[PDB]
A paper describes a structure:
Noroviruses are highly contagious, infecting both humans and animals. The human norovirus capsid protruding (P) domain binds histo-blood group antigen (HBGA) co-factors for infection, and a recently discovered bat norovirus (GX) was also found to interact with HBGAs. In this study, we determined the P domain structures of four human noroviruses and one bat norovirus using X-ray crystallography to examine structural features linked to potential interspecies transmission. The principal structural difference was a variable length P2 subdomain loop (Loop A), which was located near the HBGA pocket.
The P domains of [name].9 (AY038599), [name].23 (KT290889), [name].27 (MG495077), GVIII (AJ844470), and GX (MF373609) were expressed in E.coli. The five P domains were structurally equivalent with a root mean square deviation for C-alpha atoms ranging between 0.586 Å ([name].23-[name].27) and 1.645 Å ([name].9-GX). The cross-reactivity of the P domains was determined using direct ELISA with a broad-spectrum human norovirus Nanobody (Fc-NB26) that binds to a highly conserved region on the P domain. Fc-NB26 bound to [name].9, [name].23, and [name]. P domains in a dose-dependent manner at concentrations less than 80 ng/mL. Structural modeling of the Fc-NB26-binding site indicated that [name].9, [name].23, and [name]. P domains contained most of the equivalent residues that could interact with Fc-NB26. Our cumulative data show that Fc-NB26/NB26 binds most [name] genotypes, and the epitope is vulnerable and a therapeutic target region for [name] noroviruses.
Numbering used by the authors:
A (entry chain B): 224 to 346, 350 to 533
B (entry chain A): 225 to 414, 416 to 533
């Protein structure tokens, strides 16, 4: 009975739900040779968060917890980062969640800053230190589901056994950055549980539509990007509204609000992703003022106008 | 038409003056401050003000390019030409204080400058070179002139910053020795600020402003700096989208524990986009983590709040 609605925000007014940066563009590409199963940015149209998805954009790809010395290999540039829930409460692995909320959902070298503030003041006047660090999501000691990750720094000294928070910035490099490959949240001992399901276009001629952002790198060559299924602000909206999905597919039109011109139409699936009738890898050129409007509920077999 | 506040706990919301989750509610007298923040400003009917924009991750961020060192300007300082957050050129002639998201406090803003070169490398598959480094943007430096289209950034490196497209991701403060959250920088340098959102203060007897407070990381030094915002970023996004007409100048809001239905306290949400409570003194506000504000009715500035 509660009507379903979509926010009126433009592309530049929204945030990528897989990395804490503004959305740069809409983009579509063939993905049938990938397993498209992101864990951040997952919410059904009726407001059910899935995977590792939480509500605060600034906590996406962030970690909070404390450092407890080095790992077992004795590498003086690597540190054991014990992690909690984003709220500071202890993470409970017995819940069927893949990892603490906001944990990165891709294989790669997550680059950012680790900041510390000591538990006890020097007088208050607590000591602080921050340094650049890299959290490899493919390292054997990347075990967020078990409560810890390994962080590498360029300094082998100035990291203490103190409360710590990691603010993400981008990637260290993109040599092996695989946005559609999930990390092993429990290490080589990984049986990932509680995952949001993979998504895929079933109707002929359709591809997934993504909200794409290009992300910074510490060094190296490349223009890495990350594609989310729906913006963080849509997740916030669906979570609040909890409007029942009347069918499996909401028909949405991307409209120029000045002219009423429809740039294209798309299928917004109840699972929280979009498909369009387009073939090939290309950005979607739209006016900066445009946004999606909900039109009606249709079936999985509705034939969209080609883009 | 009907007015609503999002059902979000404070740990589910973002400070509108720095991109971090809200840690606590706090109230204190402000008679010794001019409370005129420029980020986190939105009226209840959805008018953004000051330097306020909608993307939390763009608060205290800059986008643009590096154009060499500053005049002088040592080898650790660089001229950061800034654009609008969406990449379009910033127009200084608008009655706006500075590019959207510019910091609204005196301090040493610490974070990372990232660069991706304009042209690819023929030897690397026509791919663009990248580099990132820690940097500090002092909002009191003579060359902090964002309204004029540029700020100065200081780095520990002297040799690995190019004249290339650049973005600044904020992390915290370098130190807090001269951090003054209620003192605006000179957006045009040593020239009055323009386009400002109005300053706010309590007026009804026994009332104080209520703040949403977050602690901020530091690069080094001693301290636990915090920043206070008037309303959360998620409330701003909500009011902006709804554009619901404010029926009076004050919405009466109650902070409720949803488990018990108990009202912990009540507050006045003013049309301008800020909250007052009937409390005297610099005090924390002890409330359950699951609590949130609920809109109850439209009242006036004469409404007498129950004390807390
Ligand atoms: Cl200067």
């Amino acid at each position: 009975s509660k009507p379903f609605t979509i926010p009126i925000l433009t592309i530049g007014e929204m945030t990528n739900s897989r990395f804490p940066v503004a959305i740069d563009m809409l983009h579509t590409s063939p993905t049938d040779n990938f397993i498209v199963q992101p864990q951040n940015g997952r919410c059904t149209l009726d407001g059910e968060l899935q995977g590792t998805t939480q509500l605060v954009a600034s906590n996406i790809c962030a970690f909070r917890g404390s450092i407890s010395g080095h790992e077992n290999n004795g590498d003086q540039h690597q540190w054991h980062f014990s992690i909690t829930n984003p709220n500071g409460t202890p993470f409970d692995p017995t819940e069927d969640v893949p990892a603490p909320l906001g944990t990165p959902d891709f294989k790669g070298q997550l680059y950012g800053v680790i900041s510390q503030r000591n538990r006890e003041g020097s007088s208050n006047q607590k000591a602080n230190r921050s340094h650049e660090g890299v959290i490899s999501t493919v390292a054997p000691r990347f075990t967020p589901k078990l409560g810890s990750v390994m962080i590498g720094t360029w300094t082998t000294d100035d990291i203490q056994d103190q409360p710590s928070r990691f603010t993400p910035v981008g990637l260290n490099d993109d040599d092996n950055y695989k946005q559609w490959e999930l990390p092993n949240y429990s290490g080589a001992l990984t049986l990932n549980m509680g995952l949001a399901p993979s998504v895929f276009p079933t109707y002929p001629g359709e591809q997934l539509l993504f909200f794409r952002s290009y992300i910074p790198m510490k060094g190296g060559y490349g223009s890495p990007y990350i594609d989310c299924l729906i913006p963080q602000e849509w997740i916030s909206h669906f979570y609040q509204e909890s409007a029942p999905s009347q069918t499996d597919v909401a028909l949405i039109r991307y409209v120029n609000p000045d002219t009423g011109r429809v740039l294209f139409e798309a299928k917004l699936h109840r699972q929280g992703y979009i498909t369009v009738a387009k073939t090939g890898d290309s950005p979607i050129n739209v006016p900066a003022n445009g946004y999606f409007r909900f039109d009606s509920w249709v079936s999985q077999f509705y034939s969209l106008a080609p883009m």
